[PDB]
Design an enzyme around this catalytic site. Structure first.
Site, PDB file in Angstrom:
ATOM      1  N   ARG A   1      -1.595  -5.410  47.363  1.00  0.00           N
ATOM      2  CA  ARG A   1      -1.911  -3.959  47.530  1.00  0.00           C
ATOM      3  C   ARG A   1      -2.955  -3.675  46.139  1.00  0.00           C
ATOM      4  O   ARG A   1      -2.919  -4.248  45.275  1.00  0.00           O
ATOM      5  CB  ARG A   1      -0.584  -3.085  47.598  1.00  0.00           C
ATOM      6  CG  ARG A   1      -0.876  -1.552  47.629  1.00  0.00           C
ATOM      7  CD  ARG A   1       0.395  -1.075  47.688  1.00  0.00           C
ATOM      8  NE  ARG A   1       1.020  -0.781  46.270  1.00  0.00           N
ATOM      9  CZ  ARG A   1       2.119  -0.296  45.979  1.00  0.00           C
ATOM     10  NH1 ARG A   1       2.757   0.112  47.028  1.00  0.00           N
ATOM     11  NH2 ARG A   1       2.682  -0.011  44.830  1.00  0.00           N
ATOM     12  N   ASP A   2      -3.616  -2.650  46.384  1.00  0.00           N
ATOM     13  CA  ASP A   2      -4.496  -2.330  45.325  1.00  0.00           C
ATOM     14  C   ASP A   2      -5.451  -3.369  44.667  1.00  0.00           C
ATOM     15  O   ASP A   2      -5.472  -3.741  43.558  1.00  0.00           O
ATOM     16  CB  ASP A   2      -3.572  -1.713  44.213  1.00  0.00           C
ATOM     17  CG  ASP A   2      -4.297  -0.853  43.020  1.00  0.00           C
ATOM     18  OD1 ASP A   2      -5.132  -0.068  43.442  1.00  0.00           O
ATOM     19  OD2 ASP A   2      -3.579  -0.624  42.007  1.00  0.00           O
TER      20      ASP A   2
ATOM     21  N   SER B   1      -1.416  -0.387  40.480  1.00  0.00           N
ATOM     22  CA  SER B   1      -0.488  -0.232  41.423  1.00  0.00           C
ATOM     23  C   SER B   1      -0.227  -1.351  42.408  1.00  0.00           C
ATOM     24  O   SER B   1      -0.040  -1.176  43.506  1.00  0.00           O
ATOM     25  CB  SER B   1      -1.144   0.952  42.377  1.00  0.00           C
ATOM     26  OG  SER B   1      -0.738   2.250  41.596  1.00  0.00           O
TER      27      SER B   1
ATOM     28  N   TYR C   1       2.147   3.057  52.346  1.00  0.00           N
ATOM     29  CA  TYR C   1       1.524   2.160  51.212  1.00  0.00           C
ATOM     30  C   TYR C   1       2.360   1.139  50.849  1.00  0.00           C
ATOM     31  O   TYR C   1       2.999   1.289  49.792  1.00  0.00           O
ATOM     32  CB  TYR C   1       1.362   3.282  50.021  1.00  0.00           C
ATOM     33  CG  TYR C   1       0.682   3.020  48.944  1.00  0.00           C
ATOM     34  CD1 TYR C   1      -0.744   2.363  48.989  1.00  0.00           C
ATOM     35  CD2 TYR C   1       0.952   3.067  47.592  1.00  0.00           C
ATOM     36  CE1 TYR C   1      -1.544   2.165  47.981  1.00  0.00           C
ATOM     37  CE2 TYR C   1       0.349   2.681  46.438  1.00  0.00           C
ATOM     38  CZ  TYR C   1      -0.907   2.215  46.705  1.00  0.00           C
ATOM     39  OH  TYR C   1      -1.770   2.017  45.759  1.00  0.00           O
TER      40      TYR C   1
ATOM     41  N   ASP D   1      -0.696   7.382  37.522  1.00  0.00           N
ATOM     42  CA  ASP D   1      -1.463   6.513  38.336  1.00  0.00           C
ATOM     43  C   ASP D   1      -1.337   5.107  37.520  1.00  0.00           C
ATOM     44  O   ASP D   1      -1.907   4.189  38.294  1.00  0.00           O
ATOM     45  CB  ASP D   1      -2.857   7.064  38.011  1.00  0.00           C
ATOM     46  CG  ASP D   1      -3.243   8.316  38.651  1.00  0.00           C
ATOM     47  OD1 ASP D   1      -2.579   8.506  40.110  1.00  0.00           O
ATOM     48  OD2 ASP D   1      -3.787   9.178  38.020  1.00  0.00           O
TER      49      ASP D   1
ATOM     50  N   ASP E   1      -6.742   3.601  49.907  1.00  0.00           N
ATOM     51  CA  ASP E   1      -7.512   2.597  49.273  1.00  0.00           C
ATOM     52  C   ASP E   1      -7.950   1.309  49.908  1.00  0.00           C
ATOM     53  O   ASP E   1      -8.987   0.740  49.385  1.00  0.00           O
ATOM     54  CB  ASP E   1      -7.040   2.379  47.790  1.00  0.00           C
ATOM     55  CG  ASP E   1      -6.781   3.257  46.773  1.00  0.00           C
ATOM     56  OD1 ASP E   1      -7.753   4.406  46.979  1.00  0.00           O
ATOM     57  OD2 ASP E   1      -5.833   3.336  45.859  1.00  0.00           O
TER      58      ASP E   1
HETATM   59  O1  LIG Z   1      -9.485   7.084  44.119  1.00  0.00           O
HETATM   60  C1  LIG Z   1      -8.253   6.399  43.732  1.00  0.00           C
HETATM   61  C2  LIG Z   1      -8.645   4.931  43.441  1.00  0.00           C
HETATM   62  O2  LIG Z   1      -9.829   4.636  42.934  1.00  0.00           O
HETATM   63  C3  LIG Z   1     -10.194   3.240  43.046  1.00  0.00           C
HETATM   64  O3  LIG Z   1     -11.347   3.161  42.383  1.00  0.00           O
HETATM   65  C4  LIG Z   1     -12.365   3.405  42.693  1.00  0.00           C
HETATM   66  C5  LIG Z   1     -12.944   4.735  42.321  1.00  0.00           C
HETATM   67  O4  LIG Z   1     -12.091   5.859  42.734  1.00  0.00           O
HETATM   68  C6  LIG Z   1     -14.505   5.111  42.918  1.00  0.00           C
HETATM   69  O5  LIG Z   1     -14.923   6.140  42.266  1.00  0.00           O
HETATM   70  C7  LIG Z   1     -15.122   3.758  42.569  1.00  0.00           C
HETATM   71  O6  LIG Z   1     -16.302   4.134  43.200  1.00  0.00           O
HETATM   72  C8  LIG Z   1     -17.847   3.531  42.927  1.00  0.00           C
HETATM   73  C9  LIG Z   1     -18.291   2.722  44.226  1.00  0.00           C
HETATM   74  O7  LIG Z   1     -17.361   1.705  44.782  1.00  0.00           O
HETATM   75  C10 LIG Z   1     -19.651   2.248  44.077  1.00  0.00           C
HETATM   76  O8  LIG Z   1     -20.050   1.610  45.247  1.00  0.00           O
HETATM   77  C11 LIG Z   1     -20.635   3.206  43.382  1.00  0.00           C
HETATM   78  O9  LIG Z   1     -21.787   2.712  43.140  1.00  0.00           O
HETATM   79  C12 LIG Z   1     -22.955   3.403  42.924  1.00  0.00           C
HETATM   80  C13 LIG Z   1     -23.229   3.367  41.459  1.00  0.00           C
HETATM   81  O10 LIG Z   1     -22.226   4.285  40.856  1.00  0.00           O
HETATM   82  C14 LIG Z   1     -24.610   3.953  41.365  1.00  0.00           C
HETATM   83  O11 LIG Z   1     -24.929   3.764  39.776  1.00  0.00           O
HETATM   84  C15 LIG Z   1     -25.853   3.249  41.871  1.00  0.00           C
HETATM   85  O12 LIG Z   1     -26.963   3.912  41.822  1.00  0.00           O
HETATM   86  O13 LIG Z   1     -25.227   3.387  43.540  1.00  0.00           O
HETATM   87  C16 LIG Z   1     -24.124   2.756  43.847  1.00  0.00           C
HETATM   88  C17 LIG Z   1     -23.710   2.923  45.250  1.00  0.00           C
HETATM   89  O14 LIG Z   1     -24.885   2.072  45.980  1.00  0.00           O
HETATM   90  O15 LIG Z   1     -19.863   3.519  42.186  1.00  0.00           O
HETATM   91  C18 LIG Z   1     -18.650   4.303  42.356  1.00  0.00           C
HETATM   92  C19 LIG Z   1     -18.548   4.980  41.038  1.00  0.00           C
HETATM   93  O16 LIG Z   1     -19.061   6.138  40.900  1.00  0.00           O
HETATM   94  O17 LIG Z   1     -14.798   2.636  43.115  1.00  0.00           O
HETATM   95  C20 LIG Z   1     -13.597   2.283  42.644  1.00  0.00           C
HETATM   96  C21 LIG Z   1     -13.052   1.245  43.422  1.00  0.00           C
HETATM   97  O18 LIG Z   1     -14.057   0.065  42.645  1.00  0.00           O
HETATM   98  C22 LIG Z   1      -8.803   2.339  42.082  1.00  0.00           C
HETATM   99  O19 LIG Z   1      -9.333   1.209  42.317  1.00  0.00           O
HETATM  100  C23 LIG Z   1      -7.540   2.869  42.956  1.00  0.00           C
HETATM  101  O20 LIG Z   1      -6.629   1.992  42.472  1.00  0.00           O
HETATM  102  C24 LIG Z   1      -7.548   4.167  42.855  1.00  0.00           C
HETATM  103  O21 LIG Z   1      -6.225   4.534  43.813  1.00  0.00           O
HETATM  104  O1  LIG Z   2       2.696   8.780  43.347  1.00  0.00           O
HETATM  105  C1  LIG Z   2       2.342   8.646  44.632  1.00  0.00           C
HETATM  106  C2  LIG Z   2       2.144   6.824  44.594  1.00  0.00           C
HETATM  107  O2  LIG Z   2       1.040   6.813  43.580  1.00  0.00           O
HETATM  108  C3  LIG Z   2       0.793   5.342  43.516  1.00  0.00           C
HETATM  109  O3  LIG Z   2      -0.371   5.155  42.561  1.00  0.00           O
HETATM  110  C4  LIG Z   2       1.901   4.414  43.064  1.00  0.00           C
HETATM  111  O4  LIG Z   2       1.628   3.033  42.918  1.00  0.00           O
HETATM  112  C5  LIG Z   2       2.930   4.626  44.009  1.00  0.00           C
HETATM  113  O5  LIG Z   2       4.164   3.923  43.365  1.00  0.00           O
HETATM  114  C6  LIG Z   2       3.182   6.177  44.229  1.00  0.00           C
HETATM  115  O6  LIG Z   2       4.363   6.326  45.300  1.00  0.00           O
END
Ligand SMILES: OC[C@H]1O[C@@H](O[C@H]2[C@H](O)[C@@H](O)[C@H](O[C@H]3[C@H](O)[C@@H](O)[C@H](O[C@H]4[C@H](O)[C@@H](O)[C@H](O)O[C@@H]4CO)O[C@@H]3CO)O[C@@H]2CO)[C@H](O)[C@@H](O)[C@@H]1O
Ligand SMILES: OC[C@H]1O[C@@H](O)[C@H](O)[C@@H](O)[C@@H]1O
Ligand SMILES: *[C@@H]1O[C@H](CO)[C@@H](O)[C@H](O)[C@H]1NC(C)=O
Length: 361
Positions: A90-91, A97, A85, A316, A137
């Site tokens: 990233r992210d 992150s 990762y 997180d 991700d």
């Molecule tokens: O899991 C850890 C990770 O999360 C990242 O953020 C994610 C969310 O986890 C994820 O749930 C979110 O999902 C979205 C998805 O991208 C959309 O396409 C979808 O859209 C739906 C909508 O909700 C409905 O209303 C509509 O009718 O349909 C569409 C699909 O056509 O919505 C979901 C949410 O329910 O996506 C996030 C990324 O944008 C973080 O970014 C990350 O850092 C974390 O590690």
């Molecule tokens: O906890 C596991 C991993 O989670 C991620 O969200 C963080 O950015 C990392 O630093 C970590 O190693």
């Protein structure tokens, strides 16, 4: 080929044990919770290579310990569980992150060297079966976040570096699982075909490396493997748990020549519904607990094992609005606060997970 979780014991790493014993237990007043905490320190969760300094330190150390144990006659032998990762930029769709490297500052070359050093190390430790999760991700953001400037800017780099990693880490004793978001991200019926096309194309473009075993789902998230009714925040997605997602997803991948086996994170899935107000609220979610323990006995043809990828208790993202890495998801009403930087120990969150554990400790 073989399920890498069959015929081995999963090594519980000493980094997570060390957080629990040196940071959590000394701050826990109740005797039963202290004893519970000691037991969760032995649950074998994945070890993350989130920074370049971990490659020649923590990775080598874990592999060396496993080799010694196995060379002493452990039965069954231990296997390692590691997360790759450290992509540059990233992210991309969040701030919490963000990593040490940037595409604009030689990030691509830094990443190729990181992958090359990991490969050299895994070759030296070929006697240790190693299970890898490749960049949580990354590819899921390619599917749904092309409208986000950082993500569209990094798209071509993510594709190139993923292919680079799949080829460079395609080794005899290695099993790789590409991250594939989760039910609430790519499991939405509108996103599942496009996700299958993207994963199957990366696999094809990588030359279908034999060490790629499949995909990992729910990493760092809280979804159920299987619940009897849809949690309110899931609607109207019909794929409201990981079992529904994977049952819909495998046919589409296999159709495109990638018959992926899955591993499903359940480290923070014990309590359902969660306290999430919206399914997209991923940061330090309240109302969650440690879930199903890692095992190869899943009772499912497409699932190699349930695993603990995100180590519960590791934050997180920071809730500090003045921090460089502040992300508004970490300031929400359903996010536990105050919270430290992502990846740092968050004792109050670890206690929440302990108290809400199912099965209990
Ligand atoms: O899991 C850890 C990770 O999360 C990242 O953020 C994610 C969310 O986890 C994820 O749930 C979110 O999902 C979205 C998805 O991208 C959309 O396409 C979808 O859209 C739906 C909508 O909700 C409905 O209303 C509509 O009718 O349909 C569409 C699909 O056509 O919505 C979901 C949410 O329910 O996506 C996030 C990324 O944008 C973080 O970014 C990350 O850092 C974390 O590690
Ligand atoms: O906890 C596991 C991993 O989670 C991620 O969200 C963080 O950015 C990392 O630093 C970590 O190693
Ligand atoms: C990454 O760590 C390796 C040692 O494992 C080191 O040689 C290299 O200089 C580091 N890369 C960067 C960009 O600092």
């Amino acid at each position: 080929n073989g399920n890498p979780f069959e015929g081995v014991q999963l090594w519980a790493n000493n980094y997570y044990r060390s957080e629990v014993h040196t940071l959590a237990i000394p701050q826990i007043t109740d005797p039963a919770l202290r004893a519970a905490a000691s037991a969760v320190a032995e649950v074998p969760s994945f070890q993350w290579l989130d920074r370049n300094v971990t490659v020649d330190t923590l990775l080598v150390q874990t592999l060396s310990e496993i080799r010694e144990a196995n060379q002493a006659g452990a039965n069954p032998q231990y296997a390692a569980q590691i997360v790759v990762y450290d992509l540059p930029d990233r992210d991309c769709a969040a701030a919490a992150s963000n990593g040490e490297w940037a595409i604009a500052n030689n990030g691509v070359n830094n990443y190729k060297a990181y992958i090359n050093r990991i490969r050299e190390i895994l070759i030296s430790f070929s006697d240790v079966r190693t299970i890898l999760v490749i960049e949580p991700d990354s590819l899921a953001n390619m599917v749904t976040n092309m409208n986000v400037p950082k993500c569209s800017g990094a798209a071509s780099t993510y594709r190139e570096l993923t292919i680079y990693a799949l080829k460079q880490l395609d080794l005899p004793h290695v099993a790789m699982y590409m991250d594939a978001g989760h039910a609430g991200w790519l499991g939405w019926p509108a996103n599942i075909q496009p996700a299958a096309e993207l994963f199957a194309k990366i696999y094809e473009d990588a030359g279908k490396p034999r060490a790629v075993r499949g995909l990992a789902t729910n990493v760092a998230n809280y979804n159920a493997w299987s619940v009897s009714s849809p949690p309110p925040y899931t609607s109207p997605n019909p794929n409201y748990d990981e079992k529904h997602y994977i049952e819909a997803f495998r046919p589409l991948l296999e159709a495109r020549g990638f018959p992926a086996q899955f591993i499903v994170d359940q480290g923070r899935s014990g309590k359902q519904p969660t306290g999430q107000k919206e399914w997209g609220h991923w940061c330090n979610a309240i109302g969650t607990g440690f879930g199903m323990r890692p095992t190869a006995n899943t009772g499912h043809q497409y699932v190699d094992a349930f695993v603990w990828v995100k180590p519960g208790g590791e934050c997180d993202g920071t809730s500090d609005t003045t921090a460089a890495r502040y992300d508004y998801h970490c300031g929400l009403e359903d996010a536990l606060k105050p919270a430290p930087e992502a990846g740092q120990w968050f004792n109050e969150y670890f206690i929440q997970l302990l108290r809400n554990a199912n099965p209990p400790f």
